[PDB]
Amino acid sequence: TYKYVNLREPSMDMKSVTDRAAQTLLWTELIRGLGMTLSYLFREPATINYPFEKGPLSP
């Protein structure tokens, strides 16, 4: 039922422009991209050791 994708330029003046300009002068979104991968490292790996553990199956 008609969703949209584009935001059509959210920046207007001073406060909404400089923070969008901040993620190009310095990075921040790279640190935000680092954050999701950091939490992904600390959670336990879901691995099955084949000759000893076996994958789930059906009847």
Partner: protein, 296 residues
């Protein structure tokens, strides 16, 4: 003189054991597990790869152009190991008159390793693909020269031993705050796969992985150090190994997380985005020791 042999064989082991850490850290970053079937925790695989790739694995020649193909690994492995010589690990192996000049030159001479390998194959598609990879290495050495010349301009001469004395209580990360971000990206130059990717295959990347450790230690001196302490060399070395390896994990982080930049846009990162920023900082770092007294 046993020290040179104590900076080749355990150094090549660090390159060999890198392949495990690259597979295990990136592994845990991808929810899979590292090597385990090989040894106790896969620790017996770096020697297992050495027996596999060298002894029984042969080379089918594409053309073998007499002098080349055998000359390119000498420029690869040889120049990567000579970089270890002037490094200020407590008391360096024959301390240079100018440290960083030898560091910047042998890294810029390491460009030939990928150049001569481009000449090694007769096919035109290989050399055009090779020159594209040279273009990445050639461009980021301009920024590598600029950032170095602005860091040294703050404190110290070209000697690497004086770079320890300036970081007695304060790291060079904080005064060179935009340069700390800048140098970290510019180190990804010698085919690091994180920004963009292009004798036998085995020993060729043994030099490329060695350059990654080389830049990791070079960051750990120019930006890190904490103290020196001439009384105990042990307290510095334990502290240095933690600082260097924390930056080694970060090169395994950028490769894991981020896709290729598009070659053209990677060349648009330089000249258009990086070079206007670094030269403005280079202008700024000229004025700083003149504005406030500090010319050692």
């Amino acid at each position: 003189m046993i020290n040179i042999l104590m900076l080749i064989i355990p150094i090549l082991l660090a390159v060999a054991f890198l392949t495990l850490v690259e597979r295990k850290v990136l592994g845990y970053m991808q929810l899979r597990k590292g090597p385990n079937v090989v040894g106790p925790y896969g620790l017996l695989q770096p020697i297992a790869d050495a027996i596999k790739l060298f002894i029984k694995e042969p080379l089918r020649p594409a053309t073998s152009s007499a002098s080349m193909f055998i000359l390119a690994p000498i420029m690869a492995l040889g120049l990567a190991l000579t970089m270890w010589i002037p490094l200020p690990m407590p008391y360096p192996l024959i301390n240079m008159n100018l440290g960083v000049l030898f560091m910047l030159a042998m890294s810029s001479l390491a460009v030939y390793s990928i150049l001569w390998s481009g000449w090694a194959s007769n096919s035109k598609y290989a050399l055009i693909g090779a020159l594209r990879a040279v273009a990445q290495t050639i461009s980021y050495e301009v920024t590598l020269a600029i950032i170095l010349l602005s860091v040294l301009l703050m404190s110290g001469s070209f000697t690497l031993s004086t770079l320890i004395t300036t970081q007695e209580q304060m790291w060079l990360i904080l005064p060179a705050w935009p340069l700390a971000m800048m140098w970290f990206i510019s180190t990804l130059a010698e085919t690091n796969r994180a920004p963009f990717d292009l004798g036998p295959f085995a020993l060729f990347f043994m030099a490329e992985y060695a350059n990654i450790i080389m830049m990791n230690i070079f960051t750990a001196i120019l930006f890190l150090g904490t103290s020196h302490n001439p009384h105990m060399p042990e307290l510095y070395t334990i502290n240095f190994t933690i600082k260097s390896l924390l930056l080694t994990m970060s090169f395994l982080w950028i490769r894991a997380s981020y896709p290729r930049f598009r070659y053209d846009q990677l060349m648009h990162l330089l000249w258009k985005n990086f070079l206007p920023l670094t030269l403005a900082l280079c202008m700024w770092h000229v004025s700083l020791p003149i504005l406030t007294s500090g010319i050692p």
